[PDB]
Design a protein around this ligand. Sequence first.
Ligand SMILES: Nc1ncnc2c1ncn2[C@H]1C[C@H](O)[C@@H](COP(=O)(O)OP(=O)(O)O)O1
Length: 174
Amino acid sequence: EFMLLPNILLTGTPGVGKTTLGKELASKSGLKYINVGDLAREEQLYDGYDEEYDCPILDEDRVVDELDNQMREGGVIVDYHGCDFFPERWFHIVFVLRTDTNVLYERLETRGYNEKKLTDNIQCEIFQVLYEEATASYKEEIVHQLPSNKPEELENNVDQILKWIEQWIKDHNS
Ligand SMILES: Nc1ncnc2c1ncn2[C@H]1C[C@H](O)[C@@H](COP(=O)(O)OP(=O)(O)O)O1
C-alpha cells in the first residue's frame, strides 16, 4: 500500500460530535483515528493542573512530538477541542463541527457536567471560539464548518468527507 493519504482535523466545542464522526470516518475509510484527549491520557502527556477548570493541563509540545512522525506519513483523522498548537503542515483539511446551543447543552448536561463546566463549554460554542481558532490557525480555504445537530447531519458529514477523501487521494496519486 503505497498511497499518499490526507490528514483531517476534526475540531469544535466538546459535545459537538467529533469522536462520533471521527470513529465512523476511520471505520469507513481505513484512515487512523486519533482522539487527542485519549492519547494524552494513555501516554500521560500532562504538565500542571488548572485550578479553575479542575483538569490536568495538556502538554501541547509533547502531544505534537508524540504524533509528528505518524502525521508526516499521512492518513490520520485527529479529534481535539483545540487546534492552535498543531503544526499547520499536518492538515489538508479542517472541519469545525457546530451544534445549536440548545442541542449542545442537553448533550453536555447528560454527560454529568456541573454548572461551571456546562457554562464555560456552552459559552465556548456561543462565542464560536473553536471556529475562530481554526480560522486563525489554518488557511481559510481549508476550514469548513459542519452542522452536527441530528443523525441525518452526521450521515451527510460522513458522506461528504468520504467523498472528499476519495477525490484527494486521486488528485495526489497521479
Ligand atoms: N450529529 C449528531 N446528531 C445527534 N447526536 C450526535 C451527533 N453527533 C454526536 N452525537 C451524540 C453522541 C454523543 O452522545 C454526543 C456527543 O458526541 P461526541 O462524538 O462524544 O462529541 P465530542 O467528541 O465533540 O465531544 O452527541
